[PDB]
Amino acid sequence: THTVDAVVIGAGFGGIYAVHKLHHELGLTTVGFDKADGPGGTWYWNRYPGALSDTESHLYRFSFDRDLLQESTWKTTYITQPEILEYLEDVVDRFDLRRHFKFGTEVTSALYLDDENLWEVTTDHGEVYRAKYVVNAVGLLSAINFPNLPGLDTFEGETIHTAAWPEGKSLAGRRVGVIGTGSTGQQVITSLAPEVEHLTVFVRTPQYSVPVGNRPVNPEQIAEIKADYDRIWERAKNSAVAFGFEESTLPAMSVSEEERNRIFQEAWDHGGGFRFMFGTFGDIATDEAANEAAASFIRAKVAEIIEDPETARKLMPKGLFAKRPLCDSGYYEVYNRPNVEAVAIKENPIREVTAKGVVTEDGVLHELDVLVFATGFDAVDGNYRRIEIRGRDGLHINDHWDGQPTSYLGVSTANFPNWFMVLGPNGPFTNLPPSIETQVEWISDTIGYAERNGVRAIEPTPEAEAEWTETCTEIANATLFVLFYLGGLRNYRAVMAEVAADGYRGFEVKS
Ligand SMILES: Cc1cc2nc3c(=O)[nH]c(=O)nc-3n(C[C@H](O)[C@H](O)[C@H](O)COP(=O)(O)OP(=O)(O)OC[C@H]3O[C@@H](n4cnc5c(N)ncnc54)[C@H](O)[C@@H]3O)c2cc1C
Numbered sequence: 001t002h003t004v005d006a007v008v009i010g011a012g013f014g015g016i017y018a019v020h021k022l023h024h025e026l027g028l029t030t031v032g033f034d035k036a037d038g039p040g041g042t043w044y045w046n047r048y049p050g051a052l053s054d055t056e057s058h059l060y061r062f063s064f065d066r067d068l069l070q071e072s073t074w075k076t077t078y079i080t081q082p083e084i085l086e087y088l089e090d091v092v093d094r095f096d097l098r099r100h101f102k103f104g105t106e107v108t109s110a111l112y113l114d115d116e117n118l119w120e121v122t123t124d125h126g127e128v129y130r131a132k133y134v135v136n137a138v139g140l141l142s143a144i145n146f147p148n149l150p151g152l153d154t155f156e157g158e159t160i161h162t163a164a165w166p167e168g169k170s171l172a173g174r175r176v177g178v179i180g181t182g183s184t185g186q187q188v189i190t191s192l193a194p195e196v197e198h199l200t201v202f203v204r205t206p207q208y209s210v211p212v213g214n215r216p217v218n219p220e221q222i223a224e225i226k227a228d229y230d231r232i233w234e235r236a237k238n239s240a241v242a243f244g245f246e247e248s249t250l251p252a253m254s255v256s257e258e259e260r261n262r263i264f265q266e267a268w269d270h271g272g273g274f275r276f277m278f279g280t281f282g283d284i285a286t287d288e289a290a291n292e293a294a295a296s297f298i299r300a301k302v303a304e305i306i307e308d309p310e311t312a313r314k315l316m317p318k319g320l321f322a323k324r325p326l327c328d329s330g331y332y333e334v335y336n337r338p339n340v341e342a343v344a345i346k347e348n349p350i351r352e353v354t355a356k357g358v359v360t361e362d363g364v365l366h367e368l369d370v371l372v373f374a375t376g377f378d379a380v381d382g383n384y385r386r387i388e389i390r391g392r393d394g395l396h397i398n399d400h401w402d403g404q405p406t407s408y409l410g411v412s413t414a415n416f417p418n419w420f421m422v423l424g425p426n427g428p429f430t431n432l433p434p435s436i437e438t439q440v441e442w443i444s445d446t447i448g449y450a451e452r453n454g455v456r457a458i459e460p461t462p463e464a465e466a467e468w469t470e471t472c473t474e475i476a477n478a479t480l481f482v483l484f485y486l487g488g489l490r491n492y493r494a495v496m497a498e499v500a501a502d503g504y505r506g507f508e509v510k511s
């Protein structure tokens with residue numbers, strides 16, 4: 001029914017910028033879609049208390065508009081969900097993007113029509129769009145992982161998942177249980193502890209966590225940032241992780257024990273997860289001894305913060321210090337509160353939930369009014385895998401990604417022509433907005449090139465896609481241990497630009 005140049009799926013950072021680029025810069029008629037009733041993406045969905053960025057406020061945003069960077073403000077060194085949502089809502093209205101989005105609208109299929117070199121895209125309300133290009137900015141919020149504890153139906157109190165937090169809902173003065181201690185669960189717990197009648201935490205795997213050091217800013221302090229913003233973004237885009245600190249090249253074991261502690265202590269006092277992992281020493285992710293030095297420093301902090309050694313034993317992180325580091329606003333301190341109990345479910349599993357609360361295998365009823373699930377989601381490619389997406393010859397995305405999801409360059413995959421991914425598989429591990437910008441700017445250039453020239457279809461070769469996996473795999477082999485590209489933002493940007501400069505190396509082009 002509707003003939004458009006381009007379709008964008010999602011209205012988070014990625015979809016917002018994709019619609020801007022395609023509409024404003026390339027002059028294409030572009031429609032965006034989100035199941036959400038408004039823009040924001042993950043910042044629209046996740047409204048739990050204590051929801052906070054792990055990227056400093058001044059860097060958790062777009063950098064493409066130099067005037068916008070002068071204009072935005074923020075209250076603290078890290079940024080909260082309502083502030084981010086407001087920022088993204090403001091971007092949408094600043095660039096008049098709203099009239100291009102269809103909200104409350106799920107894309108249920110995207111089928112390639114081989115004969116016409118078009119994508120046929122349908123919504124859950126039956127609307128059909130024919131488009132030359134599809135840009136998928138669908139994020140990771142797939143189906144909500146909402147675990148199957150026996151007797152859950154019987155609970156007479158409120159059951160809440162953090163990705164569907166009730167707007168009014170304050171749990172002040174209530175008896176609350178939280179299941180899950182990832183970034184989200186830690187954040188909810190710290191938020192809840194001081195206001196809740198009682199808090200019971202069901203801990204399965206304690207994680208490494210460092211202080212975030214979220215502090216109020218002055219208007220003079222924002223003024224300093226803003227006067228140097230160009231240099232700041234120049235540095236970020238020339239770094240590996242783009243978080244606003246100088247990345248260390250210092251081997252942890254090349255200095256004395258006393259200096260190593262001082263270095264760790266400084267980062268601990270300053271705050272920041274990536275700063276702790278990458279700002280202290282150059283080999284925490286690559287050297288077993290370096291990782292142990294970091295890991296055991298955090299363990300010692302846990303033991304020092306938590307008074308009761310039985311409580312401390314349950315919360316004690318173990319093993320390698322890896323993946324996205326967690327940071328917190330006083331998470332370990334919380335367990336020193338008289339009205340907070342930790343339950344280590346590996347050794348004392350949940351037997352059932354009843355009307356009144358949770359019974360553990362010890363046979364003790366933990367009486368609760370409220371049960372919070374901070375249990376995350378199931379999958380990461382989940383959002384691709386639940387849409388009927390069909391490429392060339394009717395090849396389904398699930399048949400194509402028979403094993404793990406793959407991409408060429410993080411943005412495209414073979415047999416799916418003119419179909420792009422923002423933050424697809426095998427892409428950078430990074431402060432995300434500047435990587436998102438990198439990918440959308442590259443997607444847009446590639447679509448510009450296709451439109452300028454005669455291009456009917458562009459897709460990666462199977463061999464390019466395989467060499468990219470091999471490339472990612474060889475970077476990942478160096479590290480300690482989903483497959484990301486781990487060469488960093490600066491390296492990723494050079495790779496993307498060179499692919500473009502080399503006449504789209506690794507793409508099959510139908511002229
Ligand atoms: C609490 C929290 C804090 C975070 N902090 C940071 C941080 O500090 N730094 C950082 O770099 N990253 C952080 N992240 C990661 C974050 O996801 C990214 O920074 C960024 O918001 C991702 O934007 P996105 O557009 O790629 O995806 P999303 O924001 O996830 O948006 C995708 C949208 O696509 C929509 N969608 C999916 N499928 C369909 C469909 N079939 N039809 C219609 N719509 C669909 C969804 O409804 C969703 O709104 C954080 C995440 C969380 C949850």
Ligand SMILES: NC(=O)c1ccc[n+]([C@@H]2O[C@H](COP(=O)([O-])OP(=O)(O)OC[C@H]3O[C@@H](n4cnc5c(N)ncnc54)[C@H](OP(=O)(O)O)[C@@H]3O)[C@@H](O)[C@H]2O)c1
Nearest residue numbers: 053054147179180181182183184185204205374375376377
């Ligand atoms: N960039 C950011 O600052 C940021 C912030 C928040 C979230 N995120 C991302 O968003 C995703 C969601 O984060 P999240 O913290 O909500 O989820 P998460 O990281 O997957 O954490 C889930 C927690 O729930 C526990 N759990 C899962 N199933 C359980 C069950 N059946 N019974 C008991 N416990 C169970 C897990 O323990 P186990 O460890 O044993 O599985 C874990 O503690 C993550 O992938 C994360 O990377 C990013």
